[PDB]
Amino acid sequence: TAAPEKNPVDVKGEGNETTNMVITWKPLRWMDWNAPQVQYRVQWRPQGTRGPWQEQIVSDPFLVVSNTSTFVPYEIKVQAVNSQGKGPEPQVTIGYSGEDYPQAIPELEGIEILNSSAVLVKWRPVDLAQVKGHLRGYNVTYWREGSQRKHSKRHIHKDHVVVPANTTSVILSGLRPYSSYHLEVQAFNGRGSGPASEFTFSTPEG
Ligand SMILES: *[C@@H]1O[C@H](CO)[C@@H](O)[C@H](O)[C@H]1NC(C)=O
Ligand SMILES: *[C@@H]1O[C@H](CO)[C@@H](O)[C@H](O)[C@H]1NC(C)=O
Ligand SMILES: *[C@@H]1O[C@H](CO)[C@@H](O)[C@H](O)[C@H]1NC(C)=O
Ligand SMILES: *[C@@H]1O[C@H](CO)[C@@H](O)[C@H](O)[C@H]1NC(C)=O
Ligand SMILES: *[C@@H]1O[C@H](CO)[C@@H](O)[C@H](O)[C@H]1NC(C)=O
């Protein structure tokens, strides 16, 4: 019997609620314990504030951190410990509290009319500090004038395009010539989508 051989890997820090941050790691292989029982030394503090480290020694491979702010980064260290001592100093990982709906509305750059049937919608990248999460993509919902209206579960179908978070334009084809479209653009993360910006445009006679 001796100190633990290695510290855990696969440290992660992600909450399911904007008031918590679940921390997790990979339980150590028993060959790495060097004793018949092993605990995990878990130190954490926000990144930015850098006060004292909060600390807690639990035996399960996870620790629920509560009473947090919405989506804020924490420094995280996990260190195996037993009767004989501690493992090497842990390596520092970063992890965030829960995600929340986005505050950023997307600002227009220009809407370029290509055909009687296609248009290139170009918005600006959103301020990440307003996303309150990991920016996952952008959400572009467009619909036609809407003249007929005889159905419900699927009336005047509002089509939409999903693009990654690092493309700041999209082409929208398949349009009807000489029509009026509305248009909404949203950022989204894991939680949800932010408020939509509103725009209209018109297709040529074709
Ligand atoms: C969040 O995850 C923890 C497990 O770490 C669980 O106990 C809790 O019930 C979860 N809450 C929600 C709302 O999913
Ligand atoms: C909860 O968190 C706030 C800061 O986020 C802190 O000021 C307050 O004292 C905390 N309370 C407890 C019981 O941890
Ligand atoms: C409409 O414009 C798009 C631009 O991407 C192009 O793919 C398509 O060929 C055009 N259609 C016609 C009929 O010009
Ligand atoms: C916005 O995207 C979300 C998920 O990405 C989903 O509710 C939907 O596809 C989009 N919104 C609309 C109104 O289509
Ligand atoms: C999008 O770009 C940012 C920085 O510009 C980057 O950190 C992020 O990982 C990118 N998204 C994906 C899915 O790789």
mmCIF file of C-alpha atoms and ligand atoms in Angstrom:
data_model
loop_
_atom_site.group_PDB
_atom_site.id
_atom_site.type_symbol
_atom_site.label_atom_id
_atom_site.label_comp_id
_atom_site.label_asym_id
_atom_site.label_seq_id
_atom_site.Cartn_x
_atom_site.Cartn_y
_atom_site.Cartn_z
ATOM 1 C CA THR A 1 0.000 0.000 0.000
ATOM 2 C CA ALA A 2 1.182 3.548 -0.973
ATOM 3 C CA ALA A 3 -0.040 6.892 -2.330
ATOM 4 C CA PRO A 4 -2.357 6.739 -5.376
ATOM 5 C CA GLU A 5 -0.545 6.143 -8.640
ATOM 6 C CA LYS A 6 -2.328 8.620 -10.960
ATOM 7 C CA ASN A 7 -5.084 11.220 -10.704
ATOM 8 C CA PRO A 8 -8.367 10.809 -12.646
ATOM 9 C CA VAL A 9 -8.758 11.904 -16.251
ATOM 10 C CA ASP A 10 -11.843 13.113 -18.150
ATOM 11 C CA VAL A 11 -12.603 15.881 -15.702
ATOM 12 C CA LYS A 12 -15.675 17.876 -16.914
ATOM 13 C CA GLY A 13 -17.707 20.729 -15.414
ATOM 14 C CA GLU A 14 -21.213 21.274 -16.827
ATOM 15 C CA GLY A 15 -24.525 21.989 -15.089
ATOM 16 C CA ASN A 16 -28.051 20.882 -15.993
ATOM 17 C CA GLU A 17 -29.443 24.059 -14.355
ATOM 18 C CA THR A 18 -28.104 27.587 -14.492
ATOM 19 C CA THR A 19 -27.779 27.379 -10.696
ATOM 20 C CA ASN A 20 -25.458 24.322 -10.614
ATOM 21 C CA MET A 21 -22.348 22.804 -12.195
ATOM 22 C CA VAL A 22 -21.984 19.042 -12.151
ATOM 23 C CA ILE A 23 -18.320 18.011 -12.077
ATOM 24 C CA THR A 24 -17.387 14.516 -13.259
ATOM 25 C CA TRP A 25 -14.292 12.341 -13.748
ATOM 26 C CA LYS A 26 -13.328 8.757 -14.717
ATOM 27 C CA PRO A 27 -13.050 6.509 -11.628
ATOM 28 C CA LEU A 28 -9.522 5.255 -11.227
ATOM 29 C CA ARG A 29 -8.605 1.720 -12.167
ATOM 30 C CA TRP A 30 -8.159 -0.309 -8.963
ATOM 31 C CA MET A 31 -4.542 -1.053 -9.965
ATOM 32 C CA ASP A 32 -3.970 2.738 -9.520
ATOM 33 C CA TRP A 33 -5.451 2.977 -5.976
ATOM 34 C CA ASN A 34 -2.577 1.363 -3.964
ATOM 35 C CA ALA A 35 -5.029 0.821 -1.094
ATOM 36 C CA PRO A 36 -8.390 -0.928 -0.637
ATOM 37 C CA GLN A 37 -10.399 2.348 -0.732
ATOM 38 C CA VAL A 38 -9.892 5.662 -2.538
ATOM 39 C CA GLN A 39 -11.438 9.128 -2.409
ATOM 40 C CA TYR A 40 -11.358 12.134 -4.725
ATOM 41 C CA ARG A 41 -10.112 15.520 -3.592
ATOM 42 C CA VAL A 42 -12.161 18.118 -5.538
ATOM 43 C CA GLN A 43 -11.121 21.772 -5.457
ATOM 44 C CA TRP A 44 -12.991 24.420 -7.459
ATOM 45 C CA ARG A 45 -13.357 28.201 -7.708
ATOM 46 C CA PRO A 46 -14.820 30.582 -10.298
ATOM 47 C CA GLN A 47 -12.548 31.829 -13.060
ATOM 48 C CA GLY A 48 -12.554 35.596 -12.729
ATOM 49 C CA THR A 49 -13.111 35.828 -9.008
ATOM 50 C CA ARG A 50 -10.195 33.638 -7.862
ATOM 51 C CA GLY A 51 -10.998 33.733 -4.168
ATOM 52 C CA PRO A 52 -10.126 30.746 -2.010
ATOM 53 C CA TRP A 53 -10.576 27.317 -3.457
ATOM 54 C CA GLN A 54 -13.759 25.637 -2.317
ATOM 55 C CA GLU A 55 -12.891 22.022 -1.522
ATOM 56 C CA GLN A 56 -14.657 18.708 -0.930
ATOM 57 C CA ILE A 57 -13.565 15.061 -0.620
ATOM 58 C CA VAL A 58 -16.152 12.649 -1.975
ATOM 59 C CA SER A 59 -15.895 8.969 -2.822
ATOM 60 C CA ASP A 60 -18.242 9.004 -5.820
ATOM 61 C CA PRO A 61 -16.958 10.045 -9.255
ATOM 62 C CA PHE A 62 -19.024 13.226 -9.240
ATOM 63 C CA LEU A 63 -19.749 16.362 -7.272
ATOM 64 C CA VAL A 64 -22.728 18.673 -7.592
ATOM 65 C CA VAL A 65 -21.658 22.294 -7.129
ATOM 66 C CA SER A 66 -24.697 24.408 -6.282
ATOM 67 C CA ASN A 67 -25.559 28.068 -5.618
ATOM 68 C CA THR A 68 -23.821 29.347 -8.787
ATOM 69 C CA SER A 69 -24.280 32.177 -11.238
ATOM 70 C CA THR A 70 -25.691 31.474 -14.670
ATOM 71 C CA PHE A 71 -23.044 30.180 -17.151
ATOM 72 C CA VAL A 72 -19.716 31.225 -15.616
ATOM 73 C CA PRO A 73 -16.350 29.407 -15.839
ATOM 74 C CA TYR A 74 -14.790 27.655 -12.826
ATOM 75 C CA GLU A 75 -11.313 26.271 -12.364
ATOM 76 C CA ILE A 76 -11.465 22.556 -11.462
ATOM 77 C CA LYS A 77 -8.904 20.131 -9.997
ATOM 78 C CA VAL A 78 -9.450 16.476 -9.046
ATOM 79 C CA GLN A 79 -6.863 14.588 -7.018
ATOM 80 C CA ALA A 80 -7.004 11.046 -5.801
ATOM 81 C CA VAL A 81 -6.346 10.506 -2.093
ATOM 82 C CA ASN A 82 -6.215 7.477 0.223
ATOM 83 C CA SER A 83 -4.768 6.559 3.626
ATOM 84 C CA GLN A 84 -1.160 6.920 2.451
ATOM 85 C CA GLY A 85 -1.385 10.396 0.972
ATOM 86 C CA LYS A 86 -2.331 12.113 -2.278
ATOM 87 C CA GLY A 87 -1.543 11.697 -5.931
ATOM 88 C CA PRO A 88 0.480 14.215 -7.902
ATOM 89 C CA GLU A 89 -0.802 17.743 -7.977
ATOM 90 C CA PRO A 90 -3.872 17.745 -10.212
ATOM 91 C CA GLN A 91 -3.900 19.424 -13.558
ATOM 92 C CA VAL A 92 -6.336 22.332 -13.943
ATOM 93 C CA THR A 93 -9.429 22.034 -16.099
ATOM 94 C CA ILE A 94 -12.141 24.568 -16.872
ATOM 95 C CA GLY A 95 -15.856 23.946 -16.541
ATOM 96 C CA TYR A 96 -19.013 26.011 -16.731
ATOM 97 C CA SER A 97 -22.236 26.279 -14.773
ATOM 98 C CA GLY A 98 -25.562 25.585 -16.472
ATOM 99 C CA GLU A 99 -26.558 27.220 -19.718
ATOM 100 C CA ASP A 100 -29.450 29.644 -20.147
ATOM 101 C CA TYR A 101 -31.443 31.217 -22.994
ATOM 102 C CA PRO A 102 -29.538 33.743 -25.158
ATOM 103 C CA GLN A 103 -29.806 37.506 -24.788
ATOM 104 C CA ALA A 104 -28.250 38.448 -28.128
ATOM 105 C CA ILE A 105 -30.513 39.371 -31.020
ATOM 106 C CA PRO A 106 -28.658 39.068 -34.357
ATOM 107 C CA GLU A 107 -27.947 42.308 -36.256
ATOM 108 C CA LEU A 108 -28.377 42.421 -40.041
ATOM 109 C CA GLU A 109 -25.500 43.089 -42.418
ATOM 110 C CA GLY A 110 -27.380 42.939 -45.724
ATOM 111 C CA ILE A 111 -29.853 40.705 -47.596
ATOM 112 C CA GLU A 112 -28.706 40.102 -51.164
ATOM 113 C CA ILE A 113 -31.333 39.257 -53.804
ATOM 114 C CA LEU A 114 -29.810 36.692 -56.196
ATOM 115 C CA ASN A 115 -32.678 35.410 -58.347
ATOM 116 C CA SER A 116 -36.403 35.307 -58.427
ATOM 117 C CA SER A 117 -35.712 32.229 -56.293
ATOM 118 C CA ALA A 118 -32.682 32.673 -53.996
ATOM 119 C CA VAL A 119 -31.301 35.207 -51.517
ATOM 120 C CA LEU A 120 -28.158 35.406 -49.348
ATOM 121 C CA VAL A 121 -29.009 36.526 -45.791
ATOM 122 C CA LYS A 122 -25.961 37.954 -44.019
ATOM 123 C CA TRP A 123 -25.988 38.767 -40.294
ATOM 124 C CA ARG A 124 -23.257 39.810 -37.852
ATOM 125 C CA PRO A 125 -21.638 37.458 -35.317
ATOM 126 C CA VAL A 126 -23.339 37.868 -31.955
ATOM 127 C CA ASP A 127 -21.500 39.032 -28.879
ATOM 128 C CA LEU A 128 -20.614 35.776 -27.139
ATOM 129 C CA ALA A 129 -20.772 37.431 -23.687
ATOM 130 C CA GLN A 130 -24.532 37.871 -24.322
ATOM 131 C CA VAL A 131 -25.128 34.244 -25.328
ATOM 132 C CA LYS A 132 -24.939 32.988 -21.758
ATOM 133 C CA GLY A 133 -23.781 29.656 -23.128
ATOM 134 C CA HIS A 134 -21.795 27.843 -25.782
ATOM 135 C CA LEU A 135 -22.814 29.352 -29.158
ATOM 136 C CA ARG A 136 -23.994 26.290 -31.138
ATOM 137 C CA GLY A 137 -25.457 27.793 -34.303
ATOM 138 C CA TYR A 138 -27.804 30.301 -35.802
ATOM 139 C CA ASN A 139 -31.456 29.817 -36.643
ATOM 140 C CA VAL A 140 -33.100 31.376 -39.701
ATOM 141 C CA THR A 141 -36.897 31.030 -39.972
ATOM 142 C CA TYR A 142 -38.599 32.308 -43.139
ATOM 143 C CA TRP A 143 -42.151 32.139 -44.424
ATOM 144 C CA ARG A 144 -44.190 33.419 -47.391
ATOM 145 C CA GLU A 145 -47.075 35.922 -47.627
ATOM 146 C CA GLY A 146 -49.506 33.249 -46.394
ATOM 147 C CA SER A 147 -52.521 33.749 -48.703
ATOM 148 C CA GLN A 148 -54.139 30.347 -48.124
ATOM 149 C CA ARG A 149 -54.983 29.100 -44.655
ATOM 150 C CA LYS A 150 -57.060 25.925 -44.631
ATOM 151 C CA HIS A 151 -54.964 23.750 -42.307
ATOM 152 C CA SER A 152 -53.705 24.051 -38.680
ATOM 153 C CA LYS A 153 -51.115 21.513 -37.367
ATOM 154 C CA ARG A 154 -48.990 22.627 -40.404
ATOM 155 C CA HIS A 155 -50.536 25.812 -41.871
ATOM 156 C CA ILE A 156 -48.312 28.243 -43.815
ATOM 157 C CA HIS A 157 -45.307 26.068 -42.892
ATOM 158 C CA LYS A 158 -42.566 28.264 -41.430
ATOM 159 C CA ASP A 159 -39.461 26.743 -42.989
ATOM 160 C CA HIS A 160 -36.080 27.218 -41.374
ATOM 161 C CA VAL A 161 -32.350 26.671 -41.770
ATOM 162 C CA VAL A 162 -29.848 25.660 -39.102
ATOM 163 C CA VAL A 163 -26.199 26.542 -39.685
ATOM 164 C CA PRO A 164 -23.144 26.226 -37.441
ATOM 165 C CA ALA A 165 -22.193 29.066 -35.135
ATOM 166 C CA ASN A 166 -19.242 30.130 -37.296
ATOM 167 C CA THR A 167 -21.077 30.720 -40.556
ATOM 168 C CA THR A 168 -22.536 34.236 -40.647
ATOM 169 C CA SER A 169 -24.474 33.882 -43.917
ATOM 170 C CA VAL A 170 -26.767 31.386 -45.602
ATOM 171 C CA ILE A 171 -28.413 31.082 -49.023
ATOM 172 C CA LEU A 172 -32.183 30.376 -49.013
ATOM 173 C CA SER A 173 -33.295 28.864 -52.344
ATOM 174 C CA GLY A 174 -36.578 27.302 -53.489
ATOM 175 C CA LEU A 175 -38.428 30.612 -53.200
ATOM 176 C CA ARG A 176 -41.496 31.689 -55.167
ATOM 177 C CA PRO A 177 -40.889 34.606 -57.561
ATOM 178 C CA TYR A 178 -42.606 37.913 -56.795
ATOM 179 C CA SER A 179 -43.565 37.117 -53.241
ATOM 180 C CA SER A 180 -43.240 38.640 -49.788
ATOM 181 C CA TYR A 181 -41.237 36.772 -47.172
ATOM 182 C CA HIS A 182 -40.759 37.437 -43.494
ATOM 183 C CA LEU A 183 -37.568 36.451 -41.737
ATOM 184 C CA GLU A 184 -36.363 35.846 -38.173
ATOM 185 C CA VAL A 185 -32.773 35.231 -37.067
ATOM 186 C CA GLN A 186 -31.855 33.753 -33.661
ATOM 187 C CA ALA A 187 -28.776 32.563 -31.888
ATOM 188 C CA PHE A 188 -29.031 29.342 -29.921
ATOM 189 C CA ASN A 189 -26.915 27.325 -27.496
ATOM 190 C CA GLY A 190 -27.695 24.081 -25.672
ATOM 191 C CA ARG A 191 -30.537 25.554 -23.623
ATOM 192 C CA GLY A 192 -32.517 27.443 -26.268
ATOM 193 C CA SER A 193 -32.795 30.191 -28.874
ATOM 194 C CA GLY A 194 -32.673 33.927 -28.176
ATOM 195 C CA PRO A 195 -35.209 36.520 -29.303
ATOM 196 C CA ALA A 196 -35.567 36.885 -33.038
ATOM 197 C CA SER A 197 -34.679 39.899 -35.151
ATOM 198 C CA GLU A 198 -37.377 40.736 -37.722
ATOM 199 C CA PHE A 199 -36.880 41.461 -41.440
ATOM 200 C CA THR A 200 -38.833 41.372 -44.722
ATOM 201 C CA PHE A 201 -37.689 41.084 -48.335
ATOM 202 C CA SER A 202 -39.192 40.573 -51.821
ATOM 203 C CA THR A 203 -38.348 38.288 -54.741
ATOM 204 C CA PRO A 204 -38.119 39.507 -58.388
ATOM 205 C CA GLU A 205 -40.731 38.752 -61.042
ATOM 206 C CA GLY A 206 -38.744 35.903 -62.648
HETATM 207 C C1 LIG B 1 -28.772 17.313 -12.478
HETATM 208 O O1 LIG B 1 -27.764 16.276 -12.321
HETATM 209 C C2 LIG B 1 -27.699 15.671 -11.011
HETATM 210 C C3 LIG B 1 -26.637 14.588 -11.064
HETATM 211 O O2 LIG B 1 -25.317 15.102 -10.945
HETATM 212 C C4 LIG B 1 -29.060 15.111 -10.596
HETATM 213 O O3 LIG B 1 -28.982 14.622 -9.260
HETATM 214 C C5 LIG B 1 -30.142 16.174 -10.720
HETATM 215 O O4 LIG B 1 -31.406 15.602 -10.388
HETATM 216 C C6 LIG B 1 -30.146 16.745 -12.140
HETATM 217 N N1 LIG B 1 -31.179 17.757 -12.291
HETATM 218 C C7 LIG B 1 -31.889 17.915 -13.413
HETATM 219 C C8 LIG B 1 -32.911 19.012 -13.391
HETATM 220 O O5 LIG B 1 -31.710 17.205 -14.404
HETATM 221 C C1 LIG B 2 -24.485 31.813 -2.669
HETATM 222 O O1 LIG B 2 -23.733 32.472 -3.733
HETATM 223 C C2 LIG B 2 -23.559 33.894 -3.606
HETATM 224 C C3 LIG B 2 -22.715 34.323 -4.788
HETATM 225 O O2 LIG B 2 -23.076 33.617 -5.969
HETATM 226 C C4 LIG B 2 -22.929 34.241 -2.253
HETATM 227 O O3 LIG B 2 -22.832 35.652 -2.089
HETATM 228 C C5 LIG B 2 -23.751 33.635 -1.124
HETATM 229 O O4 LIG B 2 -23.161 33.932 0.137
HETATM 230 C C6 LIG B 2 -23.847 32.127 -1.319
HETATM 231 N N1 LIG B 2 -24.574 31.503 -0.230
HETATM 232 C C7 LIG B 2 -24.299 30.262 0.166
HETATM 233 C C8 LIG B 2 -25.119 29.732 1.301
HETATM 234 O O5 LIG B 2 -23.422 29.598 -0.370
HETATM 235 C C1 LIG B 3 -30.784 30.937 -57.949
HETATM 236 O O1 LIG B 3 -29.680 31.409 -57.309
HETATM 237 C C2 LIG B 3 -28.954 30.362 -56.658
HETATM 238 C C3 LIG B 3 -27.802 31.050 -55.968
HETATM 239 O O2 LIG B 3 -27.144 30.195 -55.050
HETATM 240 C C4 LIG B 3 -28.495 29.306 -57.668
HETATM 241 O O3 LIG B 3 -28.124 28.158 -56.918
HETATM 242 C C5 LIG B 3 -29.574 28.912 -58.674
HETATM 243 O O4 LIG B 3 -28.954 28.326 -59.811
HETATM 244 C C6 LIG B 3 -30.363 30.126 -59.146
HETATM 245 N N1 LIG B 3 -31.506 29.716 -59.946
HETATM 246 C C7 LIG B 3 -31.817 30.285 -61.116
HETATM 247 C C8 LIG B 3 -33.026 29.736 -61.817
HETATM 248 O O5 LIG B 3 -31.161 31.213 -61.578
HETATM 249 C C1 LIG B 4 -35.002 27.581 -33.863
HETATM 250 O O1 LIG B 4 -34.223 26.528 -33.609
HETATM 251 C C2 LIG B 4 -34.782 25.738 -32.568
HETATM 252 C C3 LIG B 4 -33.760 24.659 -32.281
HETATM 253 O O2 LIG B 4 -32.539 24.903 -32.973
HETATM 254 C C4 LIG B 4 -36.153 25.215 -33.012
HETATM 255 O O3 LIG B 4 -37.121 25.588 -32.036
HETATM 256 C C5 LIG B 4 -36.584 25.696 -34.409
HETATM 257 O O4 LIG B 4 -36.058 24.851 -35.429
HETATM 258 C C6 LIG B 4 -36.178 27.148 -34.725
HETATM 259 N N1 LIG B 4 -37.311 28.049 -34.564
HETATM 260 C C7 LIG B 4 -38.298 28.161 -35.462
HETATM 261 C C8 LIG B 4 -39.371 29.165 -35.143
HETATM 262 O O5 LIG B 4 -38.324 27.487 -36.489
HETATM 263 C C1 LIG B 5 -16.679 28.751 -33.479
HETATM 264 O O1 LIG B 5 -15.634 29.764 -33.332
HETATM 265 C C2 LIG B 5 -15.148 29.956 -31.994
HETATM 266 C C3 LIG B 5 -14.138 31.082 -32.048
HETATM 267 O O2 LIG B 5 -14.288 31.868 -33.224
HETATM 268 C C4 LIG B 5 -14.559 28.646 -31.478
HETATM 269 O O3 LIG B 5 -14.050 28.821 -30.159
HETATM 270 C C5 LIG B 5 -15.632 27.563 -31.514
HETATM 271 O O4 LIG B 5 -15.112 26.326 -31.033
HETATM 272 C C6 LIG B 5 -16.177 27.400 -32.939
HETATM 273 N N1 LIG B 5 -17.234 26.398 -32.973
HETATM 274 C C7 LIG B 5 -17.008 25.091 -33.167
HETATM 275 C C8 LIG B 5 -18.220 24.206 -33.159
HETATM 276 O O5 LIG B 5 -15.878 24.644 -33.344
#
